[PDB]
Design an enzyme around this catalytic site. Sequence first.
Site, PDB file in Angstrom:
ATOM      1  N   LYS A 185       0.821  -1.208   0.000  1.00 51.31           N
ATOM      2  CA  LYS A 185       0.000   0.000   0.000  1.00 51.31           C
ATOM      3  C   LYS A 185       0.858   1.262   0.000  1.00 51.31           C
ATOM      4  CE  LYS A 185      -2.216  -1.331   3.690  1.00 51.31           C
ATOM      5  NZ  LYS A 185      -1.491  -2.626   3.797  1.00 51.31           N
TER       6      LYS A 185
ATOM      7  N   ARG B  80      12.193  -5.788   3.914  1.00 49.73           N
ATOM      8  CA  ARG B  80      11.742  -4.404   3.920  1.00 49.73           C
ATOM      9  C   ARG B  80      12.745  -3.531   4.660  1.00 49.73           C
ATOM     10  NH1 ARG B  80       5.646  -2.549   5.104  1.00 49.73           N
ATOM     11  NH2 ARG B  80       5.905  -3.384   7.219  1.00 49.73           N
TER      12      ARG B  80
ATOM     13  N   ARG C 116       0.299  -9.341  13.434  1.00 49.29           N
ATOM     14  CA  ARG C 116      -0.417  -8.316  12.684  1.00 49.29           C
ATOM     15  C   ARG C 116      -1.359  -8.935  11.661  1.00 49.29           C
ATOM     16  NH1 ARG C 116       2.684  -4.456   9.794  1.00 49.29           N
ATOM     17  NH2 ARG C 116       4.829  -5.215  10.079  1.00 49.29           N
TER      18      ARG C 116
HETATM   19  N1  LIG Z   1       4.344  -5.484  -5.963  1.00 46.43           N
HETATM   20  C1  LIG Z   1       5.302  -5.824  -5.075  1.00 46.43           C
HETATM   21  N2  LIG Z   1       6.023  -6.958  -5.198  1.00 46.43           N
HETATM   22  C2  LIG Z   1       6.980  -7.295  -4.312  1.00 46.43           C
HETATM   23  N3  LIG Z   1       7.289  -6.532  -3.245  1.00 46.43           N
HETATM   24  C3  LIG Z   1       6.643  -5.362  -3.009  1.00 46.43           C
HETATM   25  C4  LIG Z   1       5.587  -4.938  -3.930  1.00 46.43           C
HETATM   26  N4  LIG Z   1       5.111  -3.768  -3.472  1.00 46.43           N
HETATM   27  C5  LIG Z   1       5.799  -3.460  -2.346  1.00 46.43           C
HETATM   28  N5  LIG Z   1       6.713  -4.415  -2.070  1.00 46.43           N
HETATM   29  C6  LIG Z   1       7.664  -4.468  -0.935  1.00 46.43           C
HETATM   30  O1  LIG Z   1       7.046  -5.207   0.125  1.00 46.43           O
HETATM   31  C7  LIG Z   1       7.217  -4.528   1.365  1.00 46.43           C
HETATM   32  C8  LIG Z   1       5.867  -4.023   1.838  1.00 46.43           C
HETATM   33  O2  LIG Z   1       5.541  -2.861   1.076  1.00 46.43           O
HETATM   34  P1  LIG Z   1       4.625  -1.695   1.696  1.00 46.43           P
HETATM   35  O3  LIG Z   1       5.335  -1.084   2.880  1.00 46.43           O
HETATM   36  O4  LIG Z   1       4.191  -0.817   0.549  1.00 46.43           O
HETATM   37  O5  LIG Z   1       3.364  -2.534   2.249  1.00 46.43           O
HETATM   38  P2  LIG Z   1       2.250  -1.901   3.224  1.00 46.43           P
HETATM   39  O6  LIG Z   1       0.920  -2.370   2.682  1.00 46.43           O
HETATM   40  O7  LIG Z   1       2.512  -0.426   3.376  1.00 46.43           O
HETATM   41  O8  LIG Z   1       2.557  -2.658   4.615  1.00 46.43           O
HETATM   42  P3  LIG Z   1       2.264  -2.015   6.071  1.00 46.43           P
HETATM   43  O9  LIG Z   1       0.758  -2.036   6.190  1.00 46.43           O
HETATM   44  O10 LIG Z   1       2.977  -2.944   7.022  1.00 46.43           O
HETATM   45  O11 LIG Z   1       2.862  -0.630   6.013  1.00 46.43           O
HETATM   46  C9  LIG Z   1       8.178  -3.377   1.117  1.00 46.43           C
HETATM   47  O12 LIG Z   1       9.506  -3.764   1.472  1.00 46.43           O
HETATM   48  C10 LIG Z   1       8.066  -3.106  -0.372  1.00 46.43           C
HETATM   49  O13 LIG Z   1       9.288  -2.617  -0.922  1.00 46.43           O
HETATM   50  N1  LIG Z   2      -5.964   2.950  11.516  1.00 49.82           N
HETATM   51  C1  LIG Z   2      -5.315   2.371  12.503  1.00 49.82           C
HETATM   52  N2  LIG Z   2      -5.999   1.975  13.591  1.00 49.82           N
HETATM   53  C2  LIG Z   2      -5.321   1.428  14.598  1.00 49.82           C
HETATM   54  N3  LIG Z   2      -4.018   1.207  14.704  1.00 49.82           N
HETATM   55  C3  LIG Z   2      -3.368   1.616  13.609  1.00 49.82           C
HETATM   56  C4  LIG Z   2      -3.929   2.194  12.496  1.00 49.82           C
HETATM   57  N4  LIG Z   2      -2.967   2.488  11.555  1.00 49.82           N
HETATM   58  C5  LIG Z   2      -1.857   2.086  12.102  1.00 49.82           C
HETATM   59  N5  LIG Z   2      -2.028   1.549  13.344  1.00 49.82           N
HETATM   60  C6  LIG Z   2      -0.991   1.052  14.227  1.00 49.82           C
HETATM   61  O1  LIG Z   2       0.259   1.279  13.628  1.00 49.82           O
HETATM   62  C7  LIG Z   2       0.884   0.012  13.336  1.00 49.82           C
HETATM   63  C8  LIG Z   2       1.685   0.137  12.078  1.00 49.82           C
HETATM   64  O2  LIG Z   2       0.812   0.517  11.013  1.00 49.82           O
HETATM   65  P1  LIG Z   2       1.169   0.131   9.540  1.00 49.82           P
HETATM   66  O3  LIG Z   2       2.486   0.753   9.299  1.00 49.82           O
HETATM   67  O4  LIG Z   2       0.128   0.728   8.688  1.00 49.82           O
HETATM   68  O5  LIG Z   2       1.164  -1.261   9.397  1.00 49.82           O
HETATM   69  C9  LIG Z   2      -0.279  -0.974  13.310  1.00 49.82           C
HETATM   70  O6  LIG Z   2       0.173  -2.299  13.504  1.00 49.82           O
HETATM   71  C10 LIG Z   2      -1.073  -0.440  14.493  1.00 49.82           C
HETATM   72  O7  LIG Z   2      -0.441  -0.687  15.719  1.00 49.82           O
HETATM   73 MG   LIG Z   3       2.225   0.813   4.948  1.00 53.78          MG
END
Ligand SMILES: Nc1ncnc2c1ncn2[C@@H]1O[C@H](COP(=O)(O)OP(=O)(O)OP(=O)(O)O)[C@@H](O)[C@H]1O
Ligand SMILES: Nc1ncnc2c1ncn2[C@@H]1O[C@H](COP(=O)(O)O)[C@@H](O)[C@H]1O
Ligand SMILES: [Mg+2]
Length: 214
Positions: free
Chosen positions: A13, A123, A167
């Site tokens: 994301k 990551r 998570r």
């Molecule tokens: N399409 C893809 N294919 C493979 N790896 C990816 C892809 N998109 C992102 N990544 C990698 O996977 C990891 C997760 O990416 P990202 O931080 O965008 O996920 P996220 O949904 O933000 O997770 P979180 O909710 O924990 O923040 C990162 O290290 C990123 O570089």
């Molecule tokens: N909308 C949300 N509601 C509750 N906790 C959140 C929310 N967004 C982020 N967090 C907290 O922040 C952590 C890291 O968020 P994320 O980087 O998006 O995965 C999550 O595991 C939760 O502890």
């Molecule tokens: Mg994220």
Amino acid sequence: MRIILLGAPGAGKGTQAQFIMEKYGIPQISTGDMLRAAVKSGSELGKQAKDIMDAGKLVTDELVIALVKERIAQEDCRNGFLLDGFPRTIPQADAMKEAGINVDYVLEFDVPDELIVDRIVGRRVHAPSGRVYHVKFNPPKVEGKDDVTGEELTTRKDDQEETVRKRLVEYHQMTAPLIGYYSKEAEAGNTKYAKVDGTKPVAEVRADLEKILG
Ligand SMILES: Nc1ncnc2c1ncn2[C@@H]1O[C@H](COP(=O)(O)OP(=O)(O)OP(=O)(O)O)[C@@H](O)[C@H]1O
Ligand SMILES: Nc1ncnc2c1ncn2[C@@H]1O[C@H](COP(=O)(O)O)[C@@H](O)[C@H]1O
Ligand SMILES: [Mg+2]
């Protein structure tokens, strides 16, 4: 334009939010980045959230809702914004709904649990800015360095195997129901809903999103 990004932790994301912010000129509102920013600044919010986050659990709905409502009242969100990691629970979605906040697009990122744990291992983040990389699938131009500042990259605290699996359980329990939530809203014509295959490389997901958003 108002956009919600839905998907499991590690589905990509934040990576894709940066392209949407670049192309359509709307701020990325990532609650995870704001909470970690609160820790980095030593704010009272940061003091309340640090231990919850390290445990891989969700922060109290009431706190995150107040955080978002103040954030989107700022002048850079007047013409749209992208919500990344919010809403995370049905009460957070109902709070936005009762507040009259509708969004134009809901984008679901579909990635199996099995890829996510292996993905999050590699990551790396520029902790100050939150810029996110992957050592294999999206590496920095200079190994171990941020592309913008040249500063050393690090690994998030909650990205260890055990926390990531905590998570994912929270996600399927509390967050996955938002798939049906916003599909229902889309059927009522209150938003457009679309699902993308997040297993594809970053460039292909990006292309897929451009076709949807235009
Ligand atoms: N399409 C893809 N294919 C493979 N790896 C990816 C892809 N998109 C992102 N990544 C990698 O996977 C990891 C997760 O990416 P990202 O931080 O965008 O996920 P996220 O949904 O933000 O997770 P979180 O909710 O924990 O923040 C990162 O290290 C990123 O570089
Ligand atoms: N909308 C949300 N509601 C509750 N906790 C959140 C929310 N967004 C982020 N967090 C907290 O922040 C952590 C890291 O968020 P994320 O980087 O998006 O995965 C999550 O595991 C939760 O502890
Ligand atoms: Mg994220």
